[PDB]
Amino acid sequence: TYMNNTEAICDAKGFAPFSKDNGIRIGSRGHIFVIREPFVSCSPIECRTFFLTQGSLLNDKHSNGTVKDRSPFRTLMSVEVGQSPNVYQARFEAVAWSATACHDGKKWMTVGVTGPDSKAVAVIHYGGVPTDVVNSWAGDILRTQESSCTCIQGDCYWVMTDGPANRQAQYRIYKANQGRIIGQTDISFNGGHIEECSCYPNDGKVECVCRDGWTGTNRPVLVISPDLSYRVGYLCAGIPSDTPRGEDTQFTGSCTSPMGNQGYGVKGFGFRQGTDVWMGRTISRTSRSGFEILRIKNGWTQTSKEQIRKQVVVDNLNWSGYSGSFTLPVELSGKDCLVPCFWVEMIRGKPEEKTIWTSSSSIVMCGVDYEVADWSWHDGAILPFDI
Amino acid sequence: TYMNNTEAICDAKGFAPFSKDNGIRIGSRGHIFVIREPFVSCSPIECRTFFLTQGSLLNDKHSNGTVKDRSPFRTLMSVEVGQSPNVYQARFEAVAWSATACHDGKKWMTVGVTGPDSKAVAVIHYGGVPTDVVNSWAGDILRTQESSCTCIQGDCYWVMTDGPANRQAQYRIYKANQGRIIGQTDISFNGGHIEECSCYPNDGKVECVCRDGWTGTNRPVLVISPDLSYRVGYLCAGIPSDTPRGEDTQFTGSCTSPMGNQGYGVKGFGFRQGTDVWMGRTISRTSRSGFEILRIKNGWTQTSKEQIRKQVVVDNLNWSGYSGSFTLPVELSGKDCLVPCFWVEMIRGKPEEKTIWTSSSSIVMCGVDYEVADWSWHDGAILPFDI
Amino acid sequence: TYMNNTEAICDAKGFAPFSKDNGIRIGSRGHIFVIREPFVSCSPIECRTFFLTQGSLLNDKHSNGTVKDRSPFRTLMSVEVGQSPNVYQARFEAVAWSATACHDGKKWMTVGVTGPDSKAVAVIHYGGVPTDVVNSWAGDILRTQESSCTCIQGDCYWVMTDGPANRQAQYRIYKANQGRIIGQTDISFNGGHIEECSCYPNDGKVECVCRDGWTGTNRPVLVISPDLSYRVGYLCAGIPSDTPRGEDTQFTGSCTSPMGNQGYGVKGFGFRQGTDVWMGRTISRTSRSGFEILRIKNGWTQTSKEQIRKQVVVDNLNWSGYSGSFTLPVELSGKDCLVPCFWVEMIRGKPEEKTIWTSSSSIVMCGVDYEVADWSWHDGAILPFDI
Amino acid sequence: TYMNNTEAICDAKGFAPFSKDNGIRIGSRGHIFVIREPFVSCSPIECRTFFLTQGSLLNDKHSNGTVKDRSPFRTLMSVEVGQSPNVYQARFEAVAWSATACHDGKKWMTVGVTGPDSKAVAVIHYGGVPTDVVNSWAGDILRTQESSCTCIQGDCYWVMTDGPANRQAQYRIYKANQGRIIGQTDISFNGGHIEECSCYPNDGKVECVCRDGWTGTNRPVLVISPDLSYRVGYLCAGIPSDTPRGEDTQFTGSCTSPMGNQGYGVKGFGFRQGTDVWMGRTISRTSRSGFEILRIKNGWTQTSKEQIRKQVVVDNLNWSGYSGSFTLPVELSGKDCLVPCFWVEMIRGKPEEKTIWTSSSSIVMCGVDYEVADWSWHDGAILPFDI
Ligand SMILES: CC(=O)N[C@H]1[C@H]([C@H](O)[C@H](O)CO)OC(C(=O)O)=C[C@@H]1NC(=N)N
Ligand SMILES: CC(=O)N[C@H]1[C@H]([C@H](O)[C@H](O)CO)OC(C(=O)O)=C[C@@H]1NC(=N)N
Ligand SMILES: CC(=O)N[C@H]1[C@H]([C@H](O)[C@H](O)CO)OC(C(=O)O)=C[C@@H]1NC(=N)N
Ligand SMILES: CC(=O)N[C@H]1[C@H]([C@H](O)[C@H](O)CO)OC(C(=O)O)=C[C@@H]1NC(=N)N
Incomplete structure (x- = not known):
């Protein structure tokens, strides 16, 4: 039967490590796909780790150009959380260089975007097969979440973006029951920009x-x-x-308008807590080093910069990167509330390191109502590989 | 319980990519069988990719002569769609260098032909074991579909051919419930020739x-x-x-007689649409390059050459090859009609390339009622391999 | 619920190939256990291939001494029929250098003999764990079937031998319900000798x-x-x-006494057919080359040498070896009678070939009521390996 | 439904080998995690082997420093008993360099301790996800069982230790239903020390x-x-x-106070039998060689040194090491009593051998009411490896 996911998010004081896959370290000798954009989604029987392969494996000649972002070889797959993205445990999801996924209590729903950049298409899947599609509507990279979409009482919603990586673009929301689309919306955000959202369910609404x-x-x-x-x-x-x-000292918060002089970014997340918010981020302000999460007092409703809870999961001497959210189902956590969790992508090799390849590893942290001590659960691989 | 498969085929406007396995690319380092003749069949729980191994793996000395077509080593196996034909996820189906397969709602039915060429035999399987057999009846390669057979309301039917690859031969249809044969038919087609059919269910009849x-x-x-x-x-x-x-300019359509001056071919497919038809084919008229599919207006009932929908899934700079059909069960697509799909085999190495081996990869496309943009989702492998 | 297996054996006219694993060929590059003594047993959901590893893999330094027969490393494992004995699909059964196995409709029952030769012990397993044991009773290699034991209406019976490989020894039958022994018998056979029996169910009795x-x-x-x-x-x-x-010309049949001047042998099998019998054997009378099976008219009840059905599954230019029996459950074949099948072990390397290792592959043939043409479905490996 | 585990332990006369994994031997060529601290726990469907990887595989550069004991890479995983800790059959449990685990009839409960040594944290898991946590309470390695915890009628209990490896430390018991802690206790043991307990259920109480x-x-x-x-x-x-x-001659038993002049040890176990006890141990009194188990008459209640049953499972010429207990569920053994079993860890390479790595293999022995002959089922690996 269907999943409600209408409860608010639980109010945690810290996050405890769920898993760690050791994708790269294990790949020096194992048969592991070369990937990127990994994330985590859960159903009422298990959480799985979804990713985007490069149709190749680590420590192999095919892992070469693996930095580009897009190719016809990129395919969206998954494996039980914590397990590495190895070829022998992989579940084929779809063909994509930009995906999202979520389960609604009964079956999984996946959306893999692939094809030319001026005409890319999104193949929606549900129950082991594509059921509906969405063609690029602005001829210019039809991307999406690169993270767990959201299902509430049977209806699963997600976000998509068609446009330049810089100047204004076009966004849209998407709502669908059992793999078949059922209406959507164009986000009005002139001057404001949006990409790869790390959503989650809360109070019967999607954030x-x-x-x-x-x-x-x-x-x-x-x-x-x-x-x-x-x-x-x-x-x-x-x-x-x-x-x-x-x-932090030269930044002024803003509830409606973007701020800061920077035209590039990185996927990230944040959880609502009362009017408070837990916000993740890479410690090193310029590169993709370390990962830290902060709970600014009242931050979700005020321009507050009042900190009172900080914990590092990746110190600044370790490559980090992407990081999305998602929740644990009540049919797993057992709580009367949606336990919030998130993952951290730990990229390696190019661009930052001298290697012919690029890939990443992931680490999964999870709510809990106990303040967790700072530590580093970094990648570990010894670069370069048998290159 | 049993599958009906009596609904007509849905009328699509284009096909969206279901999956892509990256068999070869992944094989440069992985443990993947060396294969050929791959295809796709689906049950009410999943679609699987069936193939014919060579009792060996890529990038190994045993992948040598792998071009011959037949050996006692060739065995029919399968893996969830999109997954590569690797050794660790393979499901043994049967011993064959020519197979077909289909599920009737309850269990799978496979038919693997193997043995000497002047006395080959077909072992029919059902539920993990052979139940009935059909011996060669013309002492001369007792081949078959090399594609998904067809089951309607419990009875599964398929086609077989015993004869020369050229001059007139002998064909026959086959109907069977639960793995046990139950009557068949000899196709009268003097002057006309038939091999490896890419069937599918439509209107309670098999096409x-x-x-x-x-x-x-x-x-x-x-x-x-x-x-x-x-x-x-x-x-x-x-x-x-x-x-x-x-x-195309020098060809005149024909509803009853074969045409053109060519004594060789390749497996292929076509879907009926009203009196219209979606017909697949390799773009390059002589070799096994690129793959395109066309919907000629009225083509199934008239000698029409009226085109009004063309989409490439493999441009002409990429090796292609075989391509068969099959349908998605209503217990998966959810449609009120049999969603039509097909796969494309992308061969590599010999004969076309300088390699001691030969194999292929596959790509799965699927109905949908949206016109899909042209693209190439080609093999990708870098030949030669560690040869 | 329990399996009856009380029906007679079906009367076939020939056997059709069920599967072929390509254990060795695939091992040149794959991760396959080095084994020996493989066999086949079936339950009402599937047949599996049981074997005895050497706690090592092909094409590795540990496959060295793998000829000895016994070590503390030898462990009994299995994999779906036709699948190779690879490490990633293997199901651990028990610790043994001599096993047997069978399912009684509900769970599997295994018996792995291991330990010192003058005090070896048999660990009986049932449902994923050992339930009962049988200690060597004559301090001298406590061996067994090396083939599928037999269960009829819940009670599973098998055979064991403690003694010299030559001169008179001691045999005993064994009957047990759900993994717990329940009485047994000492076979009186003075002058007569018995080892590794290839039994099967027939007429509510075990043969x-x-x-x-x-x-x-x-x-x-x-x-x-x-x-x-x-x-x-x-x-x-x-x-x-x-x-x-x-x-054959210098041999005189015998229903009660052994005959011929030879003190060594090989595992083998035979099926009862009326008073007729299908008897398997290696074609080459001295070595372990080729495999043939014969149906001598009245052979099971008379000293007959009346042949009238012969089919080779391995010509005499191919290494062969062991071969045991077993039946397909009625809950799989669908017949109203116990379809008889058997497997053929194809050994390789030592002793016959110049290699530091020894192992084998298997081929599964199965009843059917159609006369099957002679062919060779031999191992295939290219010796020596990366030795 | 829930497991009772309230029956006393069965009174065995010897233990029969359940399984053997051949972790290391197989790793010379396979893809096996480099591990340590392995153990065995069982549910009413199967027993599994839990271990602590090093986020790496044997015969690879990452297996280097693998001796340290702790790193952020260490993760707790498992595989069906007897199966090696290979990457392709591994089930991710949690992030830890010190774990324990047990099933209560319905789902599994795991506890993985990881993080800094002065602030480590224990993540409790249940049903594929962490549900509750326990932070280090003495800032100094918050370790645990490294063996199967214990569940009785739904409530699972275990033990933890925070302190120095030498001088007095702090212990505590832990009781929890469905992954959520529910009270615990501080063990008063001044002068006495405790670590990595090998518990088991007996008489409705935990020993x-x-x-x-x-x-x-x-x-x-x-x-x-x-x-x-x-x-x-x-x-x-x-x-x-x-x-x-x-x-043995210079030792005087003691029911309340520790004895002997030694400040280091090794994990071990013992089973209660009447007032008798089966106690395991390494034969060689100084190193980690061989493994033997003894049943001293009345030993659990008296200072007895009355032996009358000894059996070796690893002679003193073979590396041995850790060894924990656990029981077979009645829903598997079928007995009316908790069949007692244990495992033996067979370490290899550093510190004892000249290798850049360290890891171990395991062997599983199990109750039974028959006296089992002494033997060695040692590791087998040929050190060093392709180092
Ligand atoms: C579709 C695509 O190529 N998406 C890019 C993404 C995008 O480039 C920026 O979001 C700007 O729009 O950037 C990044 C990135 O790491 O900055 C990875 C993504 N790679 C993949 N999703 N494969
Ligand atoms: C049984 C057999 O050898 N079938 C051949 C097939 C056949 O040769 C032609 O259809 C002419 O009859 O050709 C081809 C081909 O690629 O042209 C592949 C097949 N290979 C395999 N099915 N293994
Ligand atoms: C227990 C044992 O070592 N059994 C031997 C067996 C036996 O040697 C003869 O049957 C004489 O008794 O011979 C053979 C053989 O191939 O001749 C293989 C067996 N190897 C294994 N079962 N592992
Ligand atoms: C947490 C930790 O590092 N535990 C150590 C353990 C401990 O060191 C002693 O018990 C003293 O307290 O010793 C040993 C050991 O083999 O002596 C292995 C353990 N390694 C692991 N559990 N990973």
Whole structure:
């Protein structure tokens, strides 16, 4: 039967490590796909780790150009959480260089975008097969979440973006029951930009903390109602959470407009807590090093910069990167509330390191109502490989 | 319980990519069987990719002579769609260098032909074991579909051919419930030739688009009724769909007789649409390069050459090859109609390339009611391998 | 629920190939256990291939001494029929250098013998764990079937031998419900010898065609009743079926006494057909080359040498070896009778070939009521390996 | 539904080999994790082998420093008993360099401790996800069982230790239903020390045979009641069972105080039998060589040194090491009593051997009411590896 996911998010004080896959380290000798954009989604029987292969394996000649971002070889697959993206445990999901996924209690729903950049198409899947499609509507990279979409009482919603990586673009929400689309919406956000949102269910509504790739060093936020009515803005916080980003002291929070002088970013996330918010980010303000998460007092509703809880999961001497959200189903956590969790992508090799390849590993952290000590659960691989 | 498969085929406007396995690319380092003749069949829980191994793996000394077509080592196996034909996820089906397969809602039914060429035998399997057999009846390669057979309301039917690859041969239809044969038929087609049919269910009857290897550059078509009464001919179309084949301008369609001056071919397919038809084919008229599919107006009932929908899934700079059909069960697509899909085999190495081996990869496309943009989702492997 | 297996054996006219694993060929590059003594047993959901690893893999330094027969490393494992004995699909059964196995409709029952030769012990397993044991009772290699034991209406019976490989030894039957022994019997056979029986169910009684390693070039036969009352002798046939063995022309059949001047043998099998019998054997009378099976008219009840059905599954230019029996459950074949099948072990490397290792592959043939043409489905490996 | 596990332990006369994994031997060529601290726990469907990887595989550069004990890479995983800890069959449990696990009839419960040593944290898991946590409470390695915890009628209990490896430390018991903690206890044991207990269910109470790392060459024992009331002491026996340990002749048993002049040890176990006890141990009193188990008459209640049953499972010419307990569920053994079993860890390479790596293999022995002959089922690997 169907999953409700209508409870608010639980109020945690810290996150405990769920898993760690050791994708890369294990790949020096194992048969592991070369990937990127990994994320985590859960059903009422298990959580799985979805990723985007490069139709190749680590420590092999085919892992060469693996930095480009797109190719016809990129395919969306998955494996039980914590397990590495190896070839022998992989479940084929779909053909994509940009995906998202979520389960609604009964079956999984996947969306893999692939094809030419001026005419890419999104193949929606449900129950082991594609059921519906969405063609690029602005002829210019029809991307998406690169993270767990969201299902509430049977209806699963997600976000998509067609446009430049810089200047203004076009966004849209998507709502669908059992793999068949059922209406969507065009996000009005002139001057504001949005990409790869790390959503999650909360209070019977969908909340996302996306990524402005145009001008914002602060992230845009967006609450989606079931009838497609929505709200869009930016984490109010007085602290920046993008990368690259200006300093905490030189940044002024903003609930409606983007801020900071930076035209590039990185996927990221944030959880709503009362009017408070837990916001993740890479410690090193310029590169993709280390990963830290912060709970600014009142941050979701005020421009607050009042900190009172900080914990590192990746120190600044370790490659980090992407990081999305998702929740544990009540049919697993057992809580009376949606336990919030997130993952951290730990990229390696190019661009940052001298290697002919690029890939990443992931680490899964999870709510809990106990303050967790700072530590580093970094990749570990010894670069370069048998290159 | 049993599957009906009595609904007509849905009327699509284009096909969206279901999966891609990256068999070869992944094999440069992985443990993947060396194969050929792959295809796709689906049950009410999943679609699987069936293939014919060579009892060996890529990038190994045993992948040597792998071009011959037949050996006692060739065995029919399968893996969830999109997954590569690796050794660790393979499901043993049967011993064969020529197979077909289909599920009837409850269990799978496989038929693997193997043995000497003048006395080969077909072992029929059902539920993990052989139940019935069919011995060669003309002492001369007892081949078959090399594609998904067809089950309607419990009875599964398929096609077989015993004879020369050229001059006239002997064909026969086959109908069977739960793995036990139950009557069959000899196809009368003097002057006309048939091999490896890419059938599918439609309107409570079975339709196949086979391959004349004798003289036809246009494919033969055949509608099988449940009582074994049938119809046999050639796609009426005024456009050739075999390889090698003469030009579109120099070809005259034919609903009853084969045409064109060519004594060799390749497996292929076609879907009925009203009186219209979607016909697949390799773009390059002589070699096994690129793959394109066309919807000629009225083509299934008239000698029409009226085009009004063309989409490439493999441009002409990429090795292609075989391509068969099959349908998605209503217990998966959810449609009220049999969603039509097909796969494309992408061969590599010998004969076309300087390698001691030969194998292929596959790509799965699927109905949908949206016109899909042209693209190439080609093999990708870097030949030669660690040869 | 429980399996009856009380129906007679079906009367076939030939056997069709079920599967072929390509263990060795695939091992040149794959991760396959180095094994020996493989066999086949089936439950009402699937047949599996049981074997004895050497706690090592092909094409590795540990596959060295792998000829000895016994070590503390030898462990009994299995994999779906036709699948190779690779490490990633293997199911651990038990610790042994001599096993047997069978399912009784509900769970599997395994018996792995291991330990010192003068005090070896048999660990009986049932449902994923050992339930009962049988200690060596004559301090001298406590071996067993090396083939599928037999279960009838819940009670599973098998055979064991403690003694020299030559001169007289001690045998015993074993009957047990759900993994717990329940009485057994000492076979009286002075002058007669018995080892590794290839039994099967028939007419509510158990029939085995074992191996005299002392003096018989003809095999001993033994019918086990449910109350442990039994019958013991030798295939009556006027044709020898052991290896080494004297010529067909110089052999005189014998229903009660062993015959021929040979003190060594090989595992083998035979099926009862009316008073007729299908008897398997290696074609080459001295070595372990080729495999043939024969249906001598009346052979099971008379000293007959009347042949009228012969089919080779391995020509005499191909290494062969062991071969045991077993039946397909009615809950799989669908027949109203126990379809008889058997497997053929194809050994390689030492002793016969110049290699530091020894192992084998298997081939599964199965009843059917159609006369099957002679062919060779031999190993295939290219020796030596990356040695 | 829930598991009772309230029956006493069965009274065996010997233990029969359940399985053997051949982890290391197989790893010379296979893809096996490099591990340590392996153990065995069982549910009412199967027993599984839990271990602690090093986020790497054997015969690879990453298996280097693998001796340290702790890293952020260490993750707790498992595989069906007897199966090696290979990457393709591994089930991710949690992130840890110190774990324990047990099933309560419905789902599994795992606890993985990881993080800094002065602030480590324990993530409790249940049903594929962490549900509750326990932070280090003495800032100094928050370790645990490294063996199967214990569940009785739904409530699962285990033991933890925070302190120095030498001088006095702090212990505590833990009781929890469905992954959520529910009260615990601080063990009062001044002068006495406890670590990595090898518990098991017996008489509706929990009994553990731990390891004093401070001063005891005799092991401490502890009976846990359901209301957390408990008893703590040392195996009464007049024979030492730790390593290093003084001689049997120079040792005087002790039911309340530790004895012997040794400040280091090794994990170990013991089973209660009447007032008798089966105690395991490494034969060689100083190193980690061989493994033997002894049943001293009355040993659990008296300082007895009365032996009358000894059996070796690893002779003193073979590396051995850790060894924990656990029981077979009645829903598997079928007995009316909790069949007692245990495993033996066979370490290899560093520190004892000249290798850049360290890891181990395991062997599983199991109750039974038959006296089992002495033998060696040692590792087998040929060191060094392709180093
Ligand atoms: C479709 C595509 O190529 N998406 C890109 C993404 C995108 O480039 C930016 O979001 C700007 O729009 O950037 C990044 C990135 O790491 O910055 C990875 C993505 N790679 C993949 N999703 N495969
Ligand atoms: C049984 C057999 O050898 N079949 C051949 C097939 C056949 O040769 C032609 O259809 C003419 O009859 O050709 C081809 C081919 O690629 O042209 C592949 C097949 N290989 C395999 N099915 N293994
Ligand atoms: C227990 C044992 O070592 N059994 C031997 C077996 C036996 O040697 C003869 O049957 C004489 O008794 O011979 C053979 C053989 O191939 O001749 C293989 C067996 N190897 C294994 N079962 N592992
Ligand atoms: C947490 C930790 O590092 N535990 C150590 C353990 C400990 O060191 C002693 O018990 C003293 O407290 O010793 C040993 C050991 O083999 O002596 C292995 C353990 N390694 C692992 N559990 N990973």
